[PDB]
Every structure is written in structure tokens, then in C-alpha cells.
Design a protein around this motif. Sequence first.
Motif, short mmCIF file in Angstrom:
data_model
loop_
_atom_site.label_atom_id
_atom_site.label_comp_id
_atom_site.label_asym_id
_atom_site.label_seq_id
_atom_site.Cartn_x
_atom_site.Cartn_y
_atom_site.Cartn_z
N UNK B 67 0.86 -1.20 0.00
CA UNK B 67 0.00 0.00 0.00
C UNK B 67 0.86 1.21 0.00
N UNK B 68 1.85 1.24 0.87
CA UNK B 68 2.74 2.40 0.84
C UNK B 68 3.43 2.54 -0.51
N UNK B 69 3.84 1.43 -1.12
CA UNK B 69 4.47 1.44 -2.42
C UNK B 69 3.53 2.03 -3.49
N UNK B 70 2.31 1.51 -3.57
CA UNK B 70 1.38 1.98 -4.59
C UNK B 70 1.00 3.45 -4.34
N UNK B 71 0.77 3.80 -3.09
CA UNK B 71 0.39 5.21 -2.77
C UNK B 71 1.48 6.17 -3.17
N UNK B 72 2.73 5.78 -2.96
CA UNK B 72 3.85 6.63 -3.36
C UNK B 72 3.90 6.83 -4.88
N UNK B 73 3.24 5.96 -5.63
CA UNK B 73 3.17 6.07 -7.07
C UNK B 73 1.85 6.74 -7.46
N UNK B 74 1.09 7.13 -6.46
CA UNK B 74 -0.14 7.88 -6.67
C UNK B 74 -1.32 7.00 -7.08
N UNK B 75 -1.27 5.72 -6.73
CA UNK B 75 -2.36 4.79 -7.03
C UNK B 75 -2.97 4.21 -5.74
N UNK B 76 -4.25 3.85 -5.83
CA UNK B 76 -5.07 3.38 -4.70
C UNK B 76 -5.26 1.86 -4.72
N UNK B 77 -4.44 1.12 -3.97
CA UNK B 77 -4.50 -0.32 -4.13
C UNK B 77 -5.48 -1.06 -3.19
N UNK B 78 -5.64 -2.32 -3.33
CA UNK B 78 -6.52 -2.98 -2.41
C UNK B 78 -5.94 -3.44 -1.10
N UNK B 79 -4.78 -4.11 -1.07
CA UNK B 79 -4.26 -4.65 0.17
C UNK B 79 -3.57 -3.59 0.97
N UNK B 80 -3.49 -3.80 2.27
CA UNK B 80 -2.65 -2.99 3.13
C UNK B 80 -1.17 -3.33 2.95
N UNK B 81 -0.85 -4.60 2.91
CA UNK B 81 0.49 -5.13 2.82
C UNK B 81 0.40 -6.57 2.56
N UNK B 82 1.44 -7.15 1.95
CA UNK B 82 1.52 -8.59 1.69
C UNK B 82 2.29 -9.13 2.86
N UNK B 83 1.80 -10.19 3.48
CA UNK B 83 2.42 -10.77 4.63
C UNK B 83 2.83 -12.19 4.25
N UNK B 84 4.04 -12.56 4.63
CA UNK B 84 4.55 -13.86 4.38
C UNK B 84 5.00 -14.43 5.70
N UNK B 85 4.36 -15.44 6.20
CA UNK B 85 4.61 -15.96 7.55
C UNK B 85 5.08 -17.38 7.43
N UNK B 86 6.17 -17.74 8.05
CA UNK B 86 6.80 -19.03 7.86
C UNK B 86 7.68 -19.39 9.04
N UNK B 87 7.82 -20.66 9.31
CA UNK B 87 8.86 -21.17 10.22
C UNK B 87 10.14 -21.26 9.49
N UNK B 88 11.23 -20.75 10.08
CA UNK B 88 12.57 -20.80 9.48
C UNK B 88 13.52 -21.56 10.32
N UNK B 89 14.46 -22.19 9.68
CA UNK B 89 15.64 -22.79 10.28
C UNK B 89 15.34 -23.91 11.21
N UNK B 90 14.21 -24.59 11.02
CA UNK B 90 13.83 -25.62 11.98
C UNK B 90 14.42 -26.98 11.62
N UNK B 91 15.22 -27.06 10.55
CA UNK B 91 16.02 -28.24 10.21
C UNK B 91 17.45 -27.80 10.01
#
Lengths: 115, 116, 116, 115
Positions: B67-91
Motif C-alpha cells: 500500500x505504501x508502495x502503490x500510494x507513493x506512485x499515486x495509485x489506490x490499491x486494495x491490500x494494506x500489505x503482503x504478509x509472508x509468515x513461515x517457520x525458518x531454520x527448523x532443520x
Amino acid sequence: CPLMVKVLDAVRGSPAINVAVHVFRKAADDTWEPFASGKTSESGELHGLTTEEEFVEGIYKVEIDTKSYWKALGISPFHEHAEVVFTANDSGPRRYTIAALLSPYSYSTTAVVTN
Amino acid sequence: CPLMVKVLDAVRGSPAINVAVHVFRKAADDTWEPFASGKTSESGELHGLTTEEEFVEGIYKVEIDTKSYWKALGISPFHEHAEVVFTANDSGPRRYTIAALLSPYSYSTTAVVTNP
Amino acid sequence: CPLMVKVLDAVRGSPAINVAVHVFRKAADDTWEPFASGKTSESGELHGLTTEEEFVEGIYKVEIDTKSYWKALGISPFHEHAEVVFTANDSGPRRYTIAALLSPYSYSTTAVVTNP
Amino acid sequence: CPLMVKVLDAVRGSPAINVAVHVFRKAADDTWEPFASGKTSESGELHGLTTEEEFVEGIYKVEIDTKSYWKALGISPFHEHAEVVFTANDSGPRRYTIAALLSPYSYSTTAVVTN
Ligand SMILES: O=C(O)[C@H]1O[C@@H](Oc2cc(O)cc(/C=C/c3ccc(O)cc3)c2)[C@H](O)[C@@H](O)[C@@H]1O
Ligand SMILES: O=C(O)[C@H]1O[C@@H](Oc2cc(O)cc(/C=C/c3ccc(O)cc3)c2)[C@H](O)[C@@H](O)[C@@H]1O
């Protein structure tokens, strides 16, 4: 039905069935309050989450429990869940469909907002 | 570099430049603790978020501020932010690339996980 | 290197290795003439398909042999191949990266176009 | 209806309406023979392309005319068209939905194959 969710499986080429979905609304204190939940149907869809009257403007989070889905199919996935966070706006069209296409290490989500 | 983020713009066919990214790690008490942040370069890449030593096992959330990215380009997007949630380094330690392809009403994300 | 291909595997979270790629160019008579071919490396990248001189304006088809890729891994996919068809160099020379994210019943593709 | 096409617009968050779609079948000489065509509806869908009786096993190509779609919206796009090439198989479920999510420099297509 102002909010629907559609989930597809890119490995099997099918709807993603019996996927848990939890919807939250962002509260004034910036915490996420439970709002609605359900499990996708045989067609990968989840209707009836909310009503026009309850679905007021605000920020919502749809969490799709992808990890459990993949594990039930015997597959090891990357994500804990897929998350879709957006503002509901009354100036837009009336119906939000949140669609998600799942793979074990990827997903892709779009919004279809219509009258 | 064990965690790197790559962001592309599907509207212009380009790297997504100057996209803010905030990474959180789930703490023992179950809240999201700030872990690292940065912004994408002219190549749409973000390197140097963390180190092998600091990037211990856990559940991580990579929030890409679309959203911040699109707004800085002067466009009105749908999502607030893309979230990527994951367990890391568990092996054991791995190197993670989180990639995202952005459009105003949609985004894709995939992970590339390698074992040095 | 004005045309390069990057392929990722969304099932394993990895580069898609040894993916065959055939490029065609539409000839004056309207058929698809073979132009270049190669396969993706251990990094899922394919470099060296063509040269600036040879990569003239035209309509190009990049066929990514996804069925052959999945079959070689012993899986039965849906598509025959992912095809990416585009006009190139019609505003002067550009560098094109064609990226694809593969799953058995789905693929994504995007282009990153830069002006050296 | 053994073959449906659904097209979505990732820029506008809407169905992609009035998109031309052409379906071909691969002939014995390996040329592409016209098979069916139409334009997507207000809901981004195109039904009625073919019948169970005509849709025999074989290789099919669905070409979605994305370039004209984008140009009609005043947007410069990358692709000439989106192409989906696949084998219809009778051992699989009966109904093929080819879905495509369009952006100016990208697309993503899945198959949903169901009973
Ligand atoms: O029953 C219905 O009305 C429709 O369900 C449709 O399934 C949907 C519905 C919908 O709102 C969205 C999608 C989205 C597909 C999608 C494709 C690629 C991607 O990156 C993200 C999503 C599929 C079927 O595709 C269509 O063939 C059927 O008719
Ligand atoms: O970590 C890895 O193995 C690889 O990930 C790669 O991440 C990229 C880089 C890039 O230039 C393009 C892409 C394309 C990602 C993509 C993401 C979503 C989609 O629907 C289509 C494509 C990913 C890095 O380029 C490479 O340097 C690294 O090695």
C-alpha cells in the motif's frame, strides 16, 4: 453476502476443500478481533461469513490456514498461513471476493470487487 | 545473507523499487517482535536484513508494504500489505528468498529455500 | 544478454532445473520460425539464448517445456507448455527477463523489461 | 459444459469483461484448428464453448486476447495474448475451468478440473 472467499489448489487442479478461514477486524487499539470464520466447501468457497450490516468500513484480515491443508494431503508446506489484509470501503462496489491459489511454497491472491 | 526479499511490479514490468519491508519474529510470549527492516533497491532486491547468527529458528513474518508502495506512485490499491509468515531454520540454517509479484488487486509470493 | 528466462518450482521452493525452453520468432510469412533454445541451469536461469544483433524487432514466443519438466520428475501435469508471446524491440533494443513460477495445474509468468 | 474460461483483472480488481477467447484443437498434421470462441461476459466468464460430445481427448489451446483488452482500457501491455495449452483426458474429472488473472506485464493461469 458482502465477503466471500474462494480457495484453489494449484497442485491438484481442484478447489481447496475444508480449508479453515478466519477473518479479523482491526480494533481501535490496533489488535485483531475475531470477526467470522468457517471452512471452505466442496467447491472451495466460503459464503455467509458476514452481513452487509456488520461489515462496516475498516481494516480486515483474512487468514487461510494453508499449513493444515497441505499437511492433511501429506505435503510439507512453506507458510504458516496465507494472510490477506485490506480496507473495506463503501465508495467501492458492494461485494468482495478474496480468491487464493495455493501451492506448497507459494500463493497468489486477488480481490474481485463487484456490484 | 540468509533472508532476502525480491519484489517485481506486474504493471510496469520492472523491479518494484523502494518497497518497505518489515520483518517480525514471534517471541516466547506469542507477540510479533520487530526483527529487521529495509527497502528494496533499484533492482527490487533487499539484502542485509539479518545475519546467520541472528536469524535463529522461529516463526517470521515478512510484511511487504505494498500500500505504501502503490500510494507513493499515486495509485489506490486494495491490500494494506503482503504478509509472508513461515517457520525458518527448523532443520538447521537455510537461506530464504521471498519473492513477490505485485499488482494493485493482487499479489503473488513464493519462497526459494536453499541449503548452503 | 537481451533475453533471459528464470523458472521457479512452487512445489519444492526451488529453482526449476533443467527446464527446456524453445524460442520462436514470427517470420514474414506468419509461421513460427525456430529462433533459439536452451535449458535452465541449477539456478533456474537460462542465459545466452541470443545476441543483441540477432534479437531484432519481431514477435517472439518463448515456450517453456513444463510438461517435459514435470514428467522428468515423474509427475503428471496439466499444461503441455507455458507459452509467452510478445513483441520485442519495437521501441529500440531492450533486455527482457521472462520469469515463470510453476505448479502442476498452474503457472505464473511475468516480464521484466529494462533499457540498458 | 465441459470447458469454461474465467478471466480476472488484477489491476482493477474485477472480472475481465469482453475479452475475446479462441479455442483450437491440434490436428493430426500438428496445426491448430479453430474449435470454439467467444467473449467473456460481465462476470468475466465464457460458457457454452463446446459440448461433451464434441470435446474429445486431444490437445487444445485457449488463446485469451489480452492485448486488445488492455489497449481498450488505455493501458500498454506486454503480451500479444495469453495461451493455455493442455491435453483433455477422459480419465480425469469431467469439467475443465481455465482461469486466468491478468496484469499488463504478467499473468497466471490455473486449471480447476472437477466432477
Ligand atoms: O461457479 C462459479 O460461478 C465460478 O467459480 C469460478 O472459480 C473462481 C471464482 C473466483 O471468484 C475466482 C477464481 C480465481 C482464480 C485465480 C487464478 C489465478 C490466480 O493467481 C488467482 C485466482 C476462480 C470458476 O472459475 C468458474 O468457472 C465458475 O463458474
Ligand atoms: O534464491 C534463489 O535460489 C533465487 O531466487 C531468485 O528470486 C527471483 C529473482 C528474479 O529476478 C525473479 C524472480 C521471479 C519471481 C516470481 C514470483 C511470483 C510469480 O508469480 C512469478 C515470478 C524471483 C533470485 O534471482 C536468485 O538470485 C536466487 O537465487
